[PDB]
Amino acid sequence: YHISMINIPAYGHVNPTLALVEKLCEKGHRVTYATTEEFAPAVQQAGGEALIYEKNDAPLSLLKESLSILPQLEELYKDDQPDLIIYDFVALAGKLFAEKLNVPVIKLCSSYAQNESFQLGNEDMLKKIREAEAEFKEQLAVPEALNIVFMPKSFQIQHETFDDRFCFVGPSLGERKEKESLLIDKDDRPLMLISLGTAFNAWPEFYKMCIKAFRDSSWQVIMSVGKTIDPESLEDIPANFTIRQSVPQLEVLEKADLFISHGGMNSTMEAMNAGVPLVVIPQMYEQELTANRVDELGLGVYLPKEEVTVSSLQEAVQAVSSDQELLSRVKNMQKDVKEAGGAERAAAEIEAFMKKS
Ligand code: NA
Secondary structure, eight states: OEEEEEOOSOHHHHHHHHHHHHHHHHHTOEEEEEOOGGGHHHHHHTSSBOOOOOOOOSOSOOHHHHHHHHHHHHTTTTTSOOSEEEEETTOHHHHHHHHHHTOOEEEEESSOOOBTTBOOSOHHHHHHTTOOOOSOOOOSSOOOSOEEESSOTTTSTTGGGOOTTEEEOOOOOOOOOOSOOOOSOOTTOOEEEEEOTTSOTTOHHHHHHHHHHHTTSSOEEEEEOTTSSOGGGSSOOOTTEEEESOOOHHHHHTTOSEEEEOOOHHHHHHHHHTTOOEEEOOOSHHHHHHHHHHHHTTSEEEOOGGGOOHHHHHHHHHHHHTOHHHHHHHHHHHHHHHHTOHHHHHHHHHHHHHHHO
């Protein structure tokens, strides 16, 4: 089939999709992958053909912009047409389009999936409610006949309530050759990864606090600071630290013993796939959920931003990295992450979805 998968312009949502695109073309089908040009090159590598086409601090009304991409993307509606369209759950436009074309739909859940019995967001978030109705042409995100969730089922909140419409394939990570090549003997020195990723780009005191907390400690520390800070700015970088704007995460996680992260779903599932315990410091609401989920599942510790100190970072790292039972549960969750089936099982469920008709 000619498959069209519609996704928003955000890195977090597109990585899980790429490995699926890679698997699909291996199975034979062809994808038109609508995306913003910035995101176009990553699409190409895994195969498929995607034809190209801000800040989220504001509280409501983001879709219309997604309604603006609906026509822009729908210009190609006519030239090549789908037999199956897959849309990221946030990218509303793909359904509208899809509804109009009455093609089978498959929803992508980058983040937790929800069902009638279980919903996401607090009452305050809940309270906003699709208030203004404009003039053109129900519930914003219900479940499609088949929804692929990029996490093991055991990680899903209220996983008991979830249907056969929901396939929990875990993170979609392929098999690839390491960019990192980080090599010297470890020395048996525990490797800590610190990355807040995209969030907290305005909090340089955090990275300074990490340096103060762990300089000249038993740990070896890799700290991805993004452009939040500039490595040269600091007076003295400790010998046991390695500070970059970016690092190959999957790579370092496979050699790490602890991961201080921001609770992004991609970063969390990668840590789970590598079986690395977590200290989660969340910024956005979804991260707060993931941070809570990590805590309740016993996979690590949830360190709220308002409590992050030199001491709290040390205390957290020490508690986590010293709890062997926590390491076991992390291992058990890693095992679930691999059994989840990945892009392989995701692709298979799409093909078997098409036989049903
Ligand atoms: Na807590």
